[PDB]
């Protein structure tokens, strides 16, 4: 019902090798050239990637900044309020980004800022100009 395990004998392959006299050698050559063609495309990308791997030499180590470990605070200084308006004008509704810019305001405190100071800081007009970009 099935061939010996390891052998591959399909009705499709038997016909493609018995089609003519040298149909066997012909099939075995198109696979040889396909192997050579794939093999040299490897060393081509293997060489393209080897050059890119040297541009990334050093990583981004001369560009990292130390970690600001500051405790989360509750009250809003007038400075932190003005930081929030500029961050809204630049980042919109990215609460995580605005939280990181202010520094000591959690993500939920930033969301509450959108509602409490909604009228006084014209957060509606500021958001509609971030959307104009």
């Amino acid at each position: 019902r099935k061939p010996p395990k390891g052998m591959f004998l399909s009705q499709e392959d038997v016909e493609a090798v018995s089609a003519n006299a040298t149909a066997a050698t012909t099939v075995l050559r198109q696979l040889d050239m396909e192997l050579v063609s794939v093999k040299r495309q490897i060393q081509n990308i293997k060489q393209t990637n080897s050059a890119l791997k040297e541009k990334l030499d050093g990583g981004i180590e001369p560009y990292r900044l130390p970690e600001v470990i500051q405790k989360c605070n509750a009250r809003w200084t007038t400075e932190e309020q003005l930081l929030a308006v500029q961050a809204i004008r630049k980042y919109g509704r990215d609460f995580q980004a605005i939280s990181d810019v202010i520094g000591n305001k959690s993500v939920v405190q930033v969301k509450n800022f959108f509602v409490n100071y909604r009228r006084r800081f014209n957060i509606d007009e500021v958001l509609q100009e971030w959307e104009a970009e």
């Binding site: 052998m7 090798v17 075995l28 040889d32």
Partner: peptide
């Protein structure tokens, strides 16, 4: 036997092409 052997040599190349692919 000739046809069976060639099909095995063909399968050896099919396995290589799909590996380097």
């Amino acid at each position: 036997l000739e046809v069976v052997i060639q099909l095995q040599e063909k399968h050896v190349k099919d396995e290589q092409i799909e590996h380097w692919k």
